[PDB]
Design a protein around this ligand. Structure first.
Ligand code: BCL
Ligand code: BCL
Ligand code: BCL
Ligand code: BCL
Ligand SMILES: CC[C@H]1c2cc3[nH]c4c(c3C)C(=O)[C@H](C(=O)OC)c4c3nc(cc4[nH]c(cc(n2)[C@@H]1C)c(C(C)=O)c4C)[C@@H](C)[C@@H]3CCC(=O)OC/C=C(\C)CCC[C@H](C)CCC[C@H](C)CCCC(C)C
Ligand SMILES: CC[C@H]1c2cc3[nH]c4c(c3C)C(=O)[C@H](C(=O)OC)c4c3nc(cc4[nH]c(cc(n2)[C@@H]1C)c(C(C)=O)c4C)[C@@H](C)[C@@H]3CCC(=O)OC/C=C(\C)CCC[C@H](C)CCC[C@H](C)CCCC(C)C
Ligand SMILES: CC[C@H]1c2cc3[nH]c4c(c3C)C(=O)[C@H](C(=O)OC)c4c3nc(cc4[nH]c(cc(n2)[C@@H]1C)c(C(C)=O)c4C)[C@@H](C)[C@@H]3CCC(=O)OC/C=C(\C)CCC[C@H](C)CCC[C@H](C)CCCC(C)C
Ligand SMILES: COC1=C(OC)C(=O)C(C/C=C(\C)CC/C=C(\C)CC/C=C(\C)CC/C=C(\C)CC/C=C(\C)CC/C=C(\C)CC/C=C(/C)CC/C=C(\C)CC/C=C(\C)CCC=C(C)C)=C(C)C1=O
Ligand SMILES: COC1=C(OC)C(=O)C(C/C=C(\C)CC/C=C(\C)CC/C=C(\C)CC/C=C(\C)CC/C=C(\C)CC/C=C(\C)CC/C=C(\C)CC/C=C(\C)CC/C=C(\C)CCC=C(C)C)=C(C)C1=O
Ligand SMILES: COC(C)(C)C(=O)C/C=C(\C)CC/C=C(\C)CC/C=C(\C)CCCC/C(C)=C\CCC(C)CC/C=C(\C)CCC=C(C)C
Ligand SMILES: [Fe+3]
Lengths: 255, 182, 102, 325, 102
């Protein structure tokens, strides 16, 4: 084969064309990923003087099901929190924040929740997606150990109550939450725990993230038959905040 | 220096995970790549008896090492562990393509149409092939496939020098000469 | 750094070729010819390639070497056997290998 | 330790899910009958079936079965119809492409005709399967991403078997149908045209394959680590952002200085996987038709390394020294 | 490779199998051996045996006279008998002309 000039043949031309295409593709991919969380701010809440090398993308629109309307991004941050019990530890940028009161009750740090919609998630029929097992037709335990009736163990080794029900996902056939009935010495009412923070044994259920005295302050649901997205975010954030805030030794250096 | 840097990177990831309140899956997954690198530069030269068995640090010169090491066992495609590792690599790539495609197709319908949900995805794959793994099983399967790819790559390289010395086609003589054949 | 090397098991490197000791148990030193020594042609009826050898060399080559290196105990006894005719050519082939392919 | 969410602790089972429908009436062609497997329920869904039966699926099944049977019966006849010897040599047999002397003409059945018939049936089967995957997404009122990513692999498939042999002018350039015999073709192809390492498109293909495996490891680990916040429900996180997405983004932002969104990570994944066969096919199509020795090409373009030391064992050791005498 | 008990990087830098400047010194000896084997097969071994050998030495198909190759002498070692000197004791097999017992 012949060369146009020097060593330039078809392979070199293909290589250079691919280089140009890949540059354009990298630009597109980076731009598509800036639809949430922009523009940037400083630690005092004001818009930062620096905004980056890549400009912001144009707007796209989603059409939601069950008559919830439209969503256009990028836009205003509707999931933003209003009053945070946090304090600055330096006059400049780049340093941590310090909780003002109780981080577990105020929802800061690893205990943070996002402000989602106050409605339950639906399935294709238009019904609430997550339902207690007592109101699911034809469902039952098919394998593994049934946890209903077993006692619940706290992270410090205290028995706080018993498992009274399970909340399952009918469309996907999976268990999402475990419902507990608290003893009078450890609070009143019922609480939910996500299935991803428990270990089911032959005689007990173990929850290691929070202690016995933390179980009365778990956020509660408004209704006994459904849970909204906000409530779920608030409940799971509470359980995850204990991995750092339950004990003073969990926060200080381990060495 | 490189070993120190890689271990420091993993421990920094652990500290970030702890501060954010997450699980430690990402540092554990990175540990397997670290293990493959350490097998390439530490364990195999140690078993073979010389530091000179490691690959050089050059963009185009570390391919010559792979070529010459592959041709020192004659036909390297006949290594069974290499076969397993190659299969895992191909399957991981296919699964990633399918997963990305399904999620994008759910979130981005044709113009003028409402978005879809997990029920729709489950229905597309049961219609397509008769089984659906679910939105939680696909992530487990992808992680397991990638980790298996790394582990079997390490095994395949570590058996070539210190455990087997002849050519790799000769290994199948156990199958070719079983007593059960006439 | 190029990866060009040959691996071998250490225990295999210490096991020699088992046929080396067999050759050393069947070889002997040559005998320097004397002045006007009797040849093999004048004592028997043999073929020309091995006819001009000495007598002692003829013994130490015929039996001590060829009848043990190939396992034929009566080799070159009957001149009409096919083995004798093949061996006569093989002597010349060996000489050619040692001379023209050094 | 804490639960890691790799195997499910307890399983529940209800009525079988027959699937959604619309005016397109998908229920008409669906089979009736489902099963449950408790062994695969530890890792994913337990339900098996049902399936969709169309014209494209049936055509693809029949043609693929025909291709398989032609290859198998040729392999069986090549050994004398001896079943024990057919089993003994299964990995070494193949159905071989025609000889180079026939060009693009039709060869005899003894020397490649069966190969051509089997290739035609396999091509029909694969194209019919692609048509089925397009039609299902059209009837479900979804996007066409699955079909486009299957078409990217079909591109390398077609380049390997159809386009390059036509460009070179011989059916003898195709790949034999066998296990050890196709791995022999791979090695011989690499040796014949120099060194395939020094093909820049082979290097780009390796880049994208490595990157796709790395990306799947990262994404799987990240989603499993935020599942305690309901992170595996990705679509609802796209429609209504929650704390799982924020934590997942902030991890990688604090690690390497930039991050993605819940929807944008799948675009990255889709492109890295699809770019592998495209660059691979471009590289394969350029070999033999444009470049005939890739190492000499690298020498010409000045990216082949140079070595100073000597060759041979006598420059480093001694034969007696290696043997230990 | 199976005849000498070595691998490919013995005699070759596999990044360029064609290049004469990337070969080792054992590649020239192999090149000489190819011609030597061709000559031995076509001039000495095949022509005899076709005239004397009995039918029980002719092989399954084609009824062929046996032939030799690399492994007939090397037998899986880098050198035949690992380099033993076998010609110093036998001057009669070293040259075509009269033996030199000097
Ligand atoms: C003649 C050549 C032989 C051959 C010789 C070999 C040899 C020899 C080897 C393999 C190896 C492999 N072969 Mg093979 N192989 C051949 C042909 C093939 C073919 C094919 C024909 O299609 C395929 C698909 C493969 C593929 C493979 C994989 C199974 C495997 C790759 C290792 C890996 O991914 O570990 C991935 C893991 C790593 C090593 C990555 C480590 C990453 C580290 C921890 C992070 C570094 C950070 C970095 C510095 C940061 C920079 C960025 C910053 C901005 C600075 N082989 C041919 C036939 N093959 C290799 C293997 O398995 O080794 C383990 C190997 O050594
Ligand atoms: C890319 C360069 C070479 C090539 C490089 C390699 C290398 C290198 C290897 C494979 C290996 C395999 N190759 Mg090949 N192979 C190529 C192209 C193909 C094509 C094709 C384009 O039609 C097919 C059907 C196959 C298929 C196969 C299987 C025989 C085997 C398993 C790997 C695999 O698919 O895992 C990925 C799996 C998926 C993506 C999907 C999983 C679905 C099933 C498993 C598909 C397999 C097909 C089936 C086994 C083929 C018929 C076999 C009979 C039923 C007995 N190869 C190209 C031409 N091939 C491996 C091997 O031989 O291991 C023993 C191996 O190491
Ligand atoms: C894995 C088994 C073999 C191997 C087989 C191959 C083969 C075969 C190929 C590569 C190729 C590459 N190899 Mg190598 N390579 C090996 C081990 C390594 C190691 C290591 C463990 O330290 C590194 C860092 C590399 C790096 C590289 C890149 C230079 C290149 C692109 C692949 C890639 O990273 O994309 C995957 C990962 C990403 C997409 C993440 C991005 C990482 C970037 C691109 C890499 C930066 C490396 C940098 C230039 C070197 C270090 C700089 C220091 C900071 C000073 N190789 C081992 C020995 N390597 C390809 C090549 O040469 O292309 C031209 C190629 O064809
Ligand atoms: C000695 C061997 C040569 C070599 C020879 C080749 C050759 C030859 C080729 C590769 C190719 C590839 N090489 Mg290379 N390669 C070498 C060494 C390596 C090494 C290494 C040493 O580390 C690596 C990592 C690789 C890696 C790769 C891949 C990146 C690439 C394959 C693309 C792909 O997506 O495959 C995935 C495979 C496919 C998608 C094939 C198509 C599959 C279709 C879709 C199957 C249809 C379905 C089927 C028919 C039906 C099944 C029935 C079921 C039961 C239902 N090579 C050495 C240098 N390499 C290929 C390439 O693209 O090169 C540019 C190629 O052709
Ligand atoms: C099966 C496991 C797969 C995997 C997983 C994996 N990799 C990972 C992770 C995970 C889960 C991370 O979390 C981590 C990350 O942060 O990714 C963004 C990472 C990572 N894997 C990376 C790369 C990488 N992964 C690879 C492969 C894989 N990664 C596997 C396929 C490969 C190859 C060759 O296929 C590469 C190149 C990095 C982008 C990143 C971590 C790198 C890092 O930050 O290292 C810290 C150190 C530095 C900043 C630079 C150190 C420089 C040295 C001191 C000098 C150079 C030495 C080197 C040996 C020279 C090499 C020269 C070459 C020419 C050979
Ligand atoms: C890796 C992806 C490939 C793939 C795989 C695949 N096919 C599958 C499955 C999977 C993972 C199933 O789970 C499902 C099945 O039931 O397998 C036993 C199936 C199936 N899809 C099929 C068609 C099919 N899909 C195809 C495509 C593909 N699917 C991809 C190439 C093709 C090809 C290659 O063109 C065909 C021919 C059959 C192989 C099988 C038929 C299933 C069916 O008709 O309906 C669902 C099942 C029932 C009728 C009820 C249960 C009876 C089962 C058929 C047997 C197993 C029952 C047992 C009690 C459980 C044991 C565990 C099982 C996992 C084996
Ligand atoms: C982006 C590139 C990657 C990729 C992508 C990719 N592959 C794909 C897709 C995508 C996006 C599909 O949508 C499609 C699919 O169906 O996925 C489930 C597919 C697919 N990729 C496949 C194979 C494949 N992909 C490969 C590679 C890759 N795929 C790349 C890594 C490879 C290799 C070598 O690495 C292979 C071997 C198939 C599983 C499937 C295409 C199915 C197809 O076309 O089938 C045609 C039908 C036949 C030939 C009939 C066969 C008849 C059989 C003899 C019996 C009947 C089938 C039965 C179910 C099998 C036997 C079961 C036993 C229990 C009896
Ligand atoms: C759903 O969920 C998910 C997400 O979310 C939504 C995600 O997003 C992601 C993430 C995925 C993507 C974003 C897709 C794209 C990803 C890839 C293609 C992967 C490959 C990645 C790369 C090629 C890039 C990786 C880059 C690396 C590793 C280099 C970055 C590192 C550095 C620059 C150094 C780090 C800095 C350190 C250690 C601190 C500095 C040290 C000090 C002591 C501070 C003191 C200061 C100084 C000494 C001087 C000042 C220092 C400076 C300025 C630092 C910079 C350095 C310089 C030299 C200038 C996934 C998977 C996910 O599933
Ligand atoms: C939105 O989410 C998603 C889902 O949920 C709604 C899904 O269902 C699916 C659909 C996924 C599947 C049906 C499964 C896909 C899985 C694979 C292609 C790979 C699975 C693994 C194998 C077939 C094993 C391969 C390994 C082999 C042959 C080597 C032998 C060793 C072992 C098996 C071990 C996807 C993509 C998805 O994205
Ligand atoms: C006899 O026993 C029974 C009945 C049980 C059997 O049936 C047994 C069967 C077997 C044991 C079968 C075994 C089969 C294999 C091991 C098969 C292996 C096959 C491969 C590895 C195939 C690879 C194929 C292709 C590759 C690598 C690349 C590209 C190919 C193509 C693009 C093919 C397409 C061809 C075309 C378009 C040419 C068509 C020509 C025209 C003129 C239209
Ligand atoms: Fe995902």
């Amino acid at each position: 084969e012949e060369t146009f000039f020097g060593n330039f043949d078809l392979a070199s031309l293909s290589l250079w064309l691919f280089y140009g295409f890949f540059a354009l593709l990298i630009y597109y991919l980076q731009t598509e990923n800036m639809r949430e969380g922009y523009p940037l701010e400083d630690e005092d809440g004001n818009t930062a003087a620096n905004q980056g090398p890549f400009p912001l993308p144009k707007e796209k629109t989603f059409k939601l099901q069950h008559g919830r309307g439209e969503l256009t991004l990028p836009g205003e941050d509707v999931q933003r929190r209003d009053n945070l019990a946090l304090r600055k530890t330096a006059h400049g940028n780049g340093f941590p924040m310090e909780p003002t009161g109780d981080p577990m009750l105020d929802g800061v740090g690893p205990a943070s929740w996002s402000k989602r919609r106050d409605v339950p998630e639906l399935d294709a029929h238009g019904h609430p997606k997550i339902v207690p097992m007592s109101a699911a037709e034809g469902f039952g335990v098919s394998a593994g150990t049934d946890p209903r009736g077993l006692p619940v163990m706290a992270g410090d080794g205290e028995i706080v109550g018993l498992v009274s029900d399970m909340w399952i996902d009918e469309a996907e056939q999976l268990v999402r939450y475990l419902e507990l009935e608290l003893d009078p010495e450890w609070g009143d009412g019922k609480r939910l725990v996500q299935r991803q923070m428990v270990r089911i044994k032959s005689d007990r259920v173990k929850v290691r993230s929070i202690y016995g005295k933390h179980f009365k302050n778990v956020p509660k649901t408004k209704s006994p038959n459904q849970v909204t997205l906000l409530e779920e975010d608030k409940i799971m954030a509470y359980y995850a905040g204990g991995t750092l805030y339950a004990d003073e030794s969990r926060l200080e250096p381990q060495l | 220096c490189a070993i120190g840097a890689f271990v420091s990177w993993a421990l920094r990831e652990v500290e970030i995970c702890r501060k954010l309140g997450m699980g430690y899956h990402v540092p554990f997954a990175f540990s397997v790549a670290i293990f493959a690198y350490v097998t390439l530069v530490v364990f195999r030269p140690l078993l073979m008896g010389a530091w000179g068995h490691g690959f050089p640090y050059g963009i185009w010169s570390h391919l010559d090492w792979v070529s010459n090491t592959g041709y020192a066992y004659l036909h390297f495609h006949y290594n069974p562990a290499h076969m397993l590792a190659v299969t895992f690599f191909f399957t991981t790539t296919l699964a990633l393509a399918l997963h990305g495609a399904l999620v994008l197709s759910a979130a981005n319908p044709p113009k003028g149409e409402e978005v879809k949900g997990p029920d729709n995805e489950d229905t597309f794959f049961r219609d397509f092939i008769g089984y659906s793994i679910g939105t939680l099983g696909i992530h487990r399967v992808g992680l397991l496939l990638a980790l298996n790819a790394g582990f079997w790559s390490a095994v395949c390289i570590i058996i070539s020098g210190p455990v087997w010395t002849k050519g790799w086609p000769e290994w199948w003589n156990w199958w070719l000469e079983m007593p059960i054949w006439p | 750094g190029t990866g060009m090397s040959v691996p071998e098991f250490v225990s295999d490197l210490d096991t020699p070729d088992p046929t080396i000791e067999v050759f050393l148990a069947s070889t002997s030193d040559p005998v320097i010819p004397e002045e006007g020594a009797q040849t093999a042609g004048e004592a028997y009826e043999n073929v020309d390639p091995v006819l001009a050898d000495l007598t002692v060399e003829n013994y130490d080559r015929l039996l001590a070497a060829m009848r043990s290196w190939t396992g034929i105990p009566d080799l070159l006894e009957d001149p009409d056997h096919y083995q004798s005719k093949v061996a006569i050519n093989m002597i010349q082939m060996n000489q050619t290998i040692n001379e023209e392919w050094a | 330790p804490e639960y890691q969410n790799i195997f499910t602790q307890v399983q529940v089972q209800g009525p079988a899910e027959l699937g959604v429908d619309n005016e397109n009436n998908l229920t008409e062609e669906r089979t009736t009958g489902t099963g449950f497997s408790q062994l695969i329920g530890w890792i994913g869904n337990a339900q098996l079936g049902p399936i969709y039966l169309g014209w494209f699926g049936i055509i693809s099944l029949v043609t693929g079965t025909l291709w398989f049977n032609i290859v198998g019966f040729n392999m069986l006849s090549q050994v004398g119809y001896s079943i024990p010897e057919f089993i003994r040599q299964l990995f070494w047999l193949a159905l071989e492409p025609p000889s180079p002397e026939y060009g693009l003409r039709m060869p005899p059945l003894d020397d490649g005709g069966w190969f051509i018939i089997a290739s035609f049936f396999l091509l029909v089967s694969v194209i019919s399967w692609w048509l089925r995957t397009y039609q299902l997404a059209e009837m479900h009122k979804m996007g066409k991403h699955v079909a486009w990513a299957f078409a990217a692999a079909i591109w390398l498939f077609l380049v390997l078997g159809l386009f390059r042999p036509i460009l070179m002018g011989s059916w003898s350039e195709a790949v034999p149908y066998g296990i050890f015999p196709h791995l022999d073709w791979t090695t011989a192809f690499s040796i014949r045209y120099g060194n395939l390492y020094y093909n820049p498109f082979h290097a780009l293909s390796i880049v994208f394959l490595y990157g796709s495996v790395l990306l799947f490891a990262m994404h799987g680990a990240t989603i499993l680590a935020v599942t305690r916040f309901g992170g595996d429900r990705e679509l609802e996180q796209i429609y209504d952002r929650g704390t799982a997405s924020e934590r997942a983004g902030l991890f990688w932002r604090w690690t390497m200085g930039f991050n993605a969104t819940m929807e944008g990570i799948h675009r990255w994944a889709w492109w890295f996987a699809v770019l592998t066969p495209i660059t691979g096919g471009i590289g394969i199509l350029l070999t033999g038709t444009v470049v005939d020795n890739w190492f000499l090409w690298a020498v010409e373009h000045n990216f082949a390394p140079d070595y100073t030391q000597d060759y041979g064992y006598e420059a480093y050791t001694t034969y007696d020294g290696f043997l230990g005498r | 490779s199976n005849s000498l008990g070595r691998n490919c990087v013995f005699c070759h830098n596999s990044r360029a199998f064609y290049d004469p400047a990337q070969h080792t010194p054992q590649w020239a000896t192999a090149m000489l051996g190819i011609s030597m084997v061709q000559e031995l097969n076509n001039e000495w071994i095949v022509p005899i045996g076709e005239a004397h050998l009995p039918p029980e030495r002719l092989g399954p198909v084609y009824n062929d006279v046996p032939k030799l190759a690399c492994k007939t002498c090397h037998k899986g070692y880098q050198q035949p008998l690992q380099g033993l000197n076998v010609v110093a004791d036998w001057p009669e097999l070293a040259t075509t002309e009269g033996p030199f017992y000097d």
